[PDB]
Design a protein around this ligand. Structure first.
Ligand SMILES: NC(=O)C1=CN([C@@H]2O[C@H](COP(=O)(O)OP(=O)(O)OC[C@H]3O[C@@H](n4cnc5c(N)ncnc54)[C@H](OP(=O)(O)O)[C@@H]3O)[C@@H](O)[C@H]2O)C=CC1
Ligand SMILES: COc1ccc(OC)c(Cc2cnc3nc(N)nc(N)c3c2C)c1
Length: 186
């Protein structure tokens, strides 16, 4: 109902996963960042909705599923019902978005966050209108089996800054990374 946003951590080789996991060792503050960003609602009494593919839901450890304080929606054409812990199941990105507009969640959803995987990212990226990409650039190459789609710089503008997102290069476990925000409106 508010903003449509994507959030991803990508290596310099554009990788996002490896055998059901993140291609690098776990970054606990990257994660804290991901939690803070998708969890905070710019409006009282409203909650954010997170959309993810089926493989993304199964890659999150059980202890962490469902993502707390958010409406969790899984995308699948094969599941008959939401996985255990999940709140909604949709068969496509359009229906996930049309549901937002159901008087049910009428006034319950604030921002919508696309949290993975590839398939779900590309399709949000081609979705017309206004969208923001929140990209954590992991500054090294990592052997990966899943990639993030190409960012069209003719459509996406990298922002010079954004409220609540550090602009300095971070370092954890001896790997460097930085946070970026891209905006579109076609
Ligand atoms: N570094 C990072 O930020 C992130 C990394 N990841 C990682 O990426 C991998 C998961 O990636 P990926 O393989 O791309 O998986 P996805 O999570 O996108 O799972 C794909 C499944 O989801 C369903 N689905 C996906 N897109 C759609 C759609 N548009 N409409 C309907 N159903 C859809 C389909 O399910 P069905 O087959 O059941 O139809 C499809 O098989 C793991 O490695 C995970 O750890 C994930 C998120 C962020
Ligand atoms: C251990 O907690 C996990 C493990 C795996 C896992 O998804 C692959 C997640 C979810 C997770 C974590 N950090 C992220 N970090 C960023 N920047 N973007 C994401 N989309 C993201 C996601 C979806 C959380």
């Amino acid at each position: 109902v508010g903003s449509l946003n994507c959030i991803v951590a990508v290596s310099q080789n554009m990788g996002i996963g490896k055998n059901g996991d993140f291609p690098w060792p776990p970054l606990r503050n990257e994660f804290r960042y991901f939690q803070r960003m998708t969890t905070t609602s710019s409006v009282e009494g409203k909650q954010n909705l997170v959309i993810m593919g089926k493989k993304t839901w199964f890659s999150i450890p059980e202890k962490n599923r469902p993502l707390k304080g958010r409406i969790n929606l899984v995308l699948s054409r094969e599941l008959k019902e939401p996985p255990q812990g999940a709140h909604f199941l949709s068969r496509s990105l359009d229906d996930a978005l049309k549901l937002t507009e159901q008087p049910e969640l009428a006034n319950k959803v604030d921002m919508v966050w696309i949290v993975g995987g590839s398939s779900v990212y590309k399709e949000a990226m081609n979705h017309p209108g206004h969208l923001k990409l929140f990209v954590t650039r992991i500054m090294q190459d990592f052997e990966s089996d899943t990639f993030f789609p190409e960012i069209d710089l003719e459509k996406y503008k990298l922002l010079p800054e954004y409220p609540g997102v550090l602009s300095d290069v971070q370092e954890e476990k001896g790997i460097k990374y930085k946070f970026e925000v891209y905006e579109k409106n076609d």
